[PDB]
Structure 1
């Protein structure tokens, strides 16, 4: 409602926020996807086999 120049009114905030979030989203989506993949396949990676030959 009364948040529009805080959100998406300005030409330089319509592209000055979707370019701002384009790096914040770039690193937190990359970390959470990698964290899910290495627990669905836990026990088969090289990190788990090298700790078994200790």
Structure 2
């Protein structure tokens, strides 16, 4: 079952809590950062410095 592998042992239940929270730190950070720069395209510094060409 899915229960027998994950939720039965509190040792491995909190392990996958920390393992999933490890991935979420970097995936969520990049997902929010990219949309924020995309919504503000043409205004950020890397766009003004790129305009100097």
TM-score (normalised: structure 1): 0.86
Helix, strand or coil at the partner of 1:19: helix
The list of structure 1 runs, each at least 4 consecutive aligned residues, that deviate by more than 4 angstroms after superposition, is: none
Query: What is the CA-CA distance between 1:38 and the residue it aligns to?
Result: 0.3
C-alpha RMSD of the superposition: 1.0
TM-score (norm 2): 0.87
What's the offset of the Cα at 1:25?
0.9
